[PDB]
Design a protein around this ligand. Sequence first.
Ligand SMILES: CC(C)C(=O)N1CCC(Cc2ccccc2)CC1
Length: 284
Amino acid sequence: MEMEKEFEQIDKSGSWAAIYQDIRHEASDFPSRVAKLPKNKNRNRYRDVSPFDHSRIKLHQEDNDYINASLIKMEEAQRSYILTQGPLPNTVGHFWEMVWEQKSRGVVMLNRVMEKGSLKCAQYWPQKEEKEMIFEDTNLKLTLISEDIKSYYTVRQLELENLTTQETREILHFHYTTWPDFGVPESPASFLNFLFKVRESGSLSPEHGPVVVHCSAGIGRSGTFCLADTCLLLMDKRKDPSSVDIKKVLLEMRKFRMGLIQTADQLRFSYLAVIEGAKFIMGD
Ligand SMILES: CC(C)C(=O)N1CCC(Cc2ccccc2)CC1
């Protein structure tokens, strides 16, 4: 059923909470035993948000391979994403180890470091060119190369150096800075513009490792970003765009990480973004 008509029928009937609860009830349940080991308690931001064992990203080291991060692999769309929590004071070195080992080109950040007067993630990148960061636990160096500040987002060029081999790579940091402290944006126009900028960079393309996407827990805003991207790509690839079922795509992505899309308002915003996005992917 054309999703724009499904949209107006849920709005007129006011049934967003009922649709959202049906997704919660049908969602996959897989074990997360590595996440719950006592040695990993200070590697998790939230006790109720864990990566499944089958899809978790492993760090390349014998001591402790654990990070709160999942590989979302979308077979028909031919896109992969890593979804992760905002880094903690003791996991900033793990975070950059993962970017290095997975060959990622881009990091997508959808939160501010402080929101609602509390810290939502560590200051994990350098703010000044001449003040680089060294992560001694994982043997990496990170330098700010340039910064472009726009009204709705900031793009940064970073240099990551593996101090063991003296190899360097360029990482692009895409920082969406205007998601409101409460609720969802009124219009999806700036979020879609932002997604279009990440795509244009090459960060989502198969010649690179998967993009790393985070917010505070790495399930809500992060879920909205990957769901909108995958839905718009499937509308481009298929003979009948109207066959793309956003609820079925979200349940497929929930096989790989729990809890993606945290509220009925986030679900409605995802529909809104895909609908308005479709009006240009179909030729405009
Ligand atoms: C100049 C033009 C090409 C442009 O900037 N956009 C972005 C916003 C909109 C929807 C959209 C579609 C796919 C991925 C992200 C956003 C239409 C295309």
